[PDB]
Amino acid sequence: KVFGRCELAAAMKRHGLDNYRGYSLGNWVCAAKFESNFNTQATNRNTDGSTDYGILQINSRWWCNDGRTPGSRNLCNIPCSALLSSDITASVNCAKKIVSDGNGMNAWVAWRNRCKGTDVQAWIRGCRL
Ligand code: NA
């Protein structure tokens, strides 16, 4: 599923991401935009052989099991393919664990390089939230 901007904002708010660990909703929509272009089916391979999955590009090195990342962890206790669903519940609940691990949203390289320090509230402008 390719989400619309406000559709994703509304779904992220309903799942409790608005101001989660202090990060306003615009941060999460900005992150999703530059990580996946709002596409739940996005995948990208990393140099070490791990793979990033879903609308927030969660990594198999630490967070999910894809059966092809030997020696890795599965801290969200899910198969990585669950992160590609049109239902974003698994992505959001795993993201909540990531953002809580000490580095905040700096864990998402696209957020640090394209969202941090900008007017992130612009990403929810116009939405009925
Ligand atoms: Na893994």
Backbone angles phi, psi at 94, to 5 degrees: -70, -40
Burial annotation 12-49 (CB, 10 A radius, 16+ → b, else e): bbebebbebeebbbbbbbbbbbbbbebebebbeeeeee
Rounded-to-integer distance, Cα 49 and Cα 19, Å:
33
Q: Which of 7, 18, 48, 52 is catalytic?
A: 52
Q: Which residues are in the CB-under-5-Å shell of ion ligand 1?
A: 60, 65, 69, 72, 74
Whole domain around residue 99: which residue ranges? Answer: 5-124
How many CA atoms does the CB half-sphere of 39 hold within 13 Å? 9
Backbone angles phi, psi at 20, to 5 degrees: -65, 125
**Residue 102 belongs to some domain of the structure:** yes
- As annotated, the binding site includes 101
For residue 77, the domain's CATH number is 1.10.530.10
How many residues appear in the chain? 129
Is 82 inside any structural domain? yes
SS3 58: strand
Asked whether 91 and 54 are in contact (CB, 8 A), the reply is: yes
Q: How many domains does the chain have?
A: 1
Experimental method: X-ray
Residue 129 is assigned to a structural domain of this protein: no
List own/partner pairs for 61-70 with CB under 8 A and 24 or more apart: 63/94, 63/97, 63/98, 64/94
Q: Going by DSSP bridges, is the β-strand pair 51-53/43-45 parallel, antiparallel, or unpaired?
A: antiparallel
Binding-site residue numbers for substrate are: 101
DSSP 68-95: S-TT---TT-SBGGGGGSSSTHHHHHHH
60 is a domain residue:
yes
DSSP SS3 for 101: coil
> 80-86 long-range contacts, Cβ below 8 Å, gap at least 24?
80/51, 80/53, 81/53, 83/40, 83/53, 83/54, 83/58, 84/40, 84/41, 84/43, 84/53, 84/54, 85/40, 86/1, 86/40
Going from the Cα of 57 to the center of ligand 1, the distance in angstroms, rounded, reads 13
C-alpha–C-alpha distance, residues 8 and 31, integer Å: 12
Ligand 1 centroid – CA 48 distance (Å)? 12
Does the active-site annotation cover 7? no
Residue 35 appears among annotated catalytic residues: yes
